[PDB]
Write a protein that binds this ligand. Sequence first.
Ligand code: NA
Ligand code: NA
Length: 327
Amino acid sequence: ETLNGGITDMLTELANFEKNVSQAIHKYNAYRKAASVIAKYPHKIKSGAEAKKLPGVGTKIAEKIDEFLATGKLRKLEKIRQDDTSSSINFLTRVSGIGPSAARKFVDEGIKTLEDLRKNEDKLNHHQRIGLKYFGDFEKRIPREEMLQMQDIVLNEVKKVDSEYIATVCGSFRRGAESSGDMDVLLTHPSFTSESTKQPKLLHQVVEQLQKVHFITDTLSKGETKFMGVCQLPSKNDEKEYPHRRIDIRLIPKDQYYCGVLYFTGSDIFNKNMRAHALEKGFTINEYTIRPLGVTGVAGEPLPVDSEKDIFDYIQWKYREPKDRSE
DNA sequence: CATTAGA
DNA sequence: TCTAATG
Ligand code: NA
Ligand code: NA
């Protein structure tokens, strides 16, 4: 957690590089396992060899360990950190809709700078274009202050459109976090569940709504179960407008809410833990359901839920407020 | 790990 | 169709 961090962090530095600049899934996958194990390791790594004993830690990595242990630096790292091309890819990648595949492709073409992108807004697709369009706004955090204003609006329409709607703004937001990245609206409705052959307009109705009013200003992607967009707070009697923000909505079968809701609310750890807990308590929990375990090895049978509570009960736990969903 | 674009 | 990009 700190006793072997540099090693791990250098490792991840390395790893990530292979994945992105180079197209070396393997090496990249190497660095990651290695970083994982060493990370586990209960002692201070003092040398390659000691490291090397490790599973996944070969001669390659060990080698880097020593050089780093010796000189608190690495060349390959130092070389890469320098490398314009590689620096370039790490950056373009920040543009929403820009992957590494694209990042290289763009570079090769010679698009390195943000402006480069602008000069050629044509070589970019709608997603990427909007990505670029709102680059600055997409990088800025979301004050809960705004979260509250945002949430409030979304809820208001949802209800206005159909009273039978169920929405939940999951995430950190939900976990009481002071700020957030983008807003996540978990959606469902009774006329939709596991079997009931859809009702795409169920999704569509709302979206239209939020656009209607002008909260949604753009669509990244819209499918029959997941809308990916950008929204905006109504720049008051201005002198102050609002940054453009990422927003996502997803329709859900009412018979799978709380689970998802459980799940999207997190935290990353709280889940796992809550997840490990169900296992002992004779269960299984995943993004959609909770199913009683059967000794034979595995087992099915999706237990009926009506609130985050049911799930809790099932594994016989303490209701944990979103607030304290921290781990 | 699944859901969307696009080509 | 596959393949990429987001979460
Ligand atoms: Na080994
Ligand atoms: Na990106």
